Design an enzyme around this catalytic site. Structure first.
Site, PDB file in Angstrom:
ATOM      1  N   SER A  45       3.290  -7.730   7.637  1.00  0.00           N
ATOM      2  CA  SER A  45       2.778  -9.108   7.558  1.00  0.00           C
ATOM      3  C   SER A  45       3.662 -10.193   6.853  1.00  0.00           C
ATOM      4  CB  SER A  45       1.549  -8.730   6.538  1.00  0.00           C
ATOM      5  OG  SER A  45       0.275  -8.240   7.531  1.00  0.00           O
ATOM      6  N   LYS A  48       3.602 -13.394   8.849  1.00  0.00           N
ATOM      7  CA  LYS A  48       2.675 -14.544   8.905  1.00  0.00           C
ATOM      8  C   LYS A  48       3.008 -15.660   8.324  1.00  0.00           C
ATOM      9  CE  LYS A  48      -0.876 -10.964   9.244  1.00  0.00           C
ATOM     10  NZ  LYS A  48      -1.511 -10.078   8.574  1.00  0.00           N
ATOM     11  N   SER A 105      -3.845 -11.554   4.499  1.00  0.00           N
ATOM     12  CA  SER A 105      -3.370 -10.763   5.331  1.00  0.00           C
ATOM     13  C   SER A 105      -4.193 -10.436   6.627  1.00  0.00           C
ATOM     14  CB  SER A 105      -2.840  -9.276   4.785  1.00  0.00           C
ATOM     15  OG  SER A 105      -1.371  -9.788   4.568  1.00  0.00           O
ATOM     16  N   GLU A 141      -1.030  -8.012  16.311  1.00  0.00           N
ATOM     17  CA  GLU A 141      -1.753  -7.055  15.531  1.00  0.00           C
ATOM     18  C   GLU A 141      -2.651  -6.099  16.075  1.00  0.00           C
ATOM     19  OE1 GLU A 141      -0.871  -6.648  12.085  1.00  0.00           O
ATOM     20  OE2 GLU A 141       0.145  -8.447  11.273  1.00  0.00           O
ATOM     21  N   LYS A 209       4.442 -13.258  -0.149  1.00  0.00           N
ATOM     22  CA  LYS A 209       3.820 -12.658   1.022  1.00  0.00           C
ATOM     23  C   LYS A 209       4.139 -11.097   1.182  1.00  0.00           C
ATOM     24  CE  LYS A 209       0.997 -12.167   4.307  1.00  0.00           C
ATOM     25  NZ  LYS A 209       0.841 -10.849   3.936  1.00  0.00           N
ATOM     26  N   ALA A 212       2.853  -4.306   4.473  1.00  0.00           N
ATOM     27  CA  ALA A 212       2.550  -3.048   4.782  1.00  0.00           C
ATOM     28  C   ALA A 212       2.554  -2.434   6.015  1.00  0.00           C
ATOM     29  CB  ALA A 212       1.396  -2.141   3.989  1.00  0.00           C
TER      30      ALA A 212
END
Length: 263
Positions: A45, A48, A105, A141, A209, A212
């Site tokens: 993440s 992003k 996230s 994702e 940010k 995982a």
């Protein structure tokens, strides 16, 4: 500081996994510390932030508007979408989508935003054109978190990520308003509590940010500094460990503790 290097090496032995690390001075751009800076790690993440950087560059050029509203279906909802699953009826603005992607996230938010810029390949083209020829986004994702060993898809390097974040936050690419918005979203991060933030003394600035993924992958990118102003960028990834999320969290926090202690 060398003691921080020892903590990264500590973490690499205890997790039984590669750990990459970069300290970067915000003002000068000089590298303060590094460990495996040219090795690839899954972004998870942490991508992003780069994603909303591309979005903001489009906003600057007038190809996008932060207030534009996007509607989507229950089908577009993938795993872990805390915010977007609450707005099937009314939809969300591009600004709200970046806010959810970055502060929380939100995976569906990230996918919706990926759609607005033309997908993973166009984020990669965005990064390429701002001088990052190393980082690559390949999937959506949640699949981009797969973290298959030695897979270079959806990966960056500590050095690539650190310099790219520097340019996004403090470089001339984005407008000052867009730079400020990006760092504002990062400052409002709500899902990185037990990491760098846990080492922060009262009155420090932090914009970060975390990420995982599968196969023990954990990471964080951050602009932080004393007295309410950021002065240093830190990038830290790990992948390959069989360890819990909790131990991985504590390992990053220990590295953060050394960072602050020897600031």
């Amino acid at each position: 500081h060398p003691e921080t290097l020892v903590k990264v090496k500590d973490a690499e032995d205890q997790l039984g996994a590669r750990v990459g690390y970069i300290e970067l001075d915000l003002n000068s751009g000089k590298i303060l510390e590094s460990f495996r800076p040219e090795e690839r790690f899954p972004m998870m993440s942490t991508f992003k932030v780069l994603l909303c950087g591309a979005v903001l560059s489009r906003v600057d050029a007038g190809q996008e508007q932060l207030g534009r509203r996007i509607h989507y279906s229950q089908n577009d909802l993938v795993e872990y979408s805390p915010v977007t699953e609450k707005h099937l009826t009314d939809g969300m603005t591009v600004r709200e989508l970046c806010s959810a992607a970055i502060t929380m996230s939100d995976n569906t938010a990230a996918n919706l935003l990926l759609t607005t810029i033309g997908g993973p390949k166009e984020l990669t083209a965005f990064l390429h054109n701002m001088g990052d020829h190393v980082t690559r986004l390949d999937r959506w994702e949640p699949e981009l978190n797969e973290a298959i060993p030695n897979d270079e898809r959806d990966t960056t390097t500590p050095a690539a990520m650190a310099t790219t974040l520097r340019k996004l936050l403090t470089g001339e690419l984005l407008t000052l308003a867009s730079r400020q918005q990006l760092i504002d979203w990062m400052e409002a991060d709500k899902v990185a509590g037990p990491l760098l933030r846990s080492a922060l003394p009262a009155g420090w600035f932090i914009a970060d940010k975390s990420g995982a993924g599968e196969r023990g992958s954990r990471g964080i990118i951050a602009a932080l500094g004393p007295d309410g102003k950021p002065s240093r960028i830190v990038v830290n990834y790990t992948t390959g460990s069989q360890a819990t999320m909790d131990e991985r969290n504590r390992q990053i926090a220990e590295i953060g503790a050394s960072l602050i202690k020897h600031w």
